[PDB]
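Holo prediction — sodium ion.
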Amino acid sequence: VGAXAXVXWXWXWXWX
Amino acid sequence: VGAXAXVXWXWXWXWX
Ligand code: NA
Protein backbone atom coordinates (compact mmCIF):
# COMPACT_ATOMS: atom_id res chain seq x y z
CA VAL A 1 0.00 0.00 0.00
CA GLY A 2 1.33 3.48 -0.82
CA ALA A 3 5.03 3.67 -1.66
CA UNK A 4 8.15 2.87 0.38
CA ALA A 5 8.33 1.80 4.01
CA UNK A 6 7.17 3.95 6.94
CA VAL A 7 6.36 7.67 6.97
CA UNK A 8 8.63 10.52 5.90
CA TRP A 9 12.38 10.19 5.57
CA UNK A 10 14.95 9.36 8.27
CA TRP A 11 14.43 9.04 12.06
CA UNK A 12 12.92 11.72 14.31
CA TRP A 13 12.77 15.44 13.67
CA UNK A 14 15.82 17.58 12.89
CA TRP A 15 19.50 16.76 13.07
CA UNK A 16 21.26 16.06 16.30
CA VAL B 1 18.87 20.87 16.42
CA GLY B 2 15.82 18.79 17.45
CA ALA B 3 16.47 15.06 17.72
CA UNK B 4 17.58 12.37 15.25
CA ALA B 5 18.15 12.88 11.55
CA UNK B 6 15.42 13.85 9.06
CA VAL B 7 11.66 13.84 9.51
CA UNK B 8 9.50 10.91 10.58
CA TRP B 9 10.61 7.29 10.36
CA UNK B 10 11.50 5.33 7.26
CA TRP B 11 11.19 6.22 3.61
CA UNK B 12 8.01 7.43 1.85
CA TRP B 13 4.45 6.70 2.93
CA UNK B 14 3.11 3.20 3.51
CA TRP B 15 4.59 -0.20 2.76
CA UNK B 16 5.20 -1.36 -0.76
NA1 NA C 1 6.80 -1.45 -8.05
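READOUT: The interface with chain B takes residues 1-16 of chain A (CB under 8 Å).
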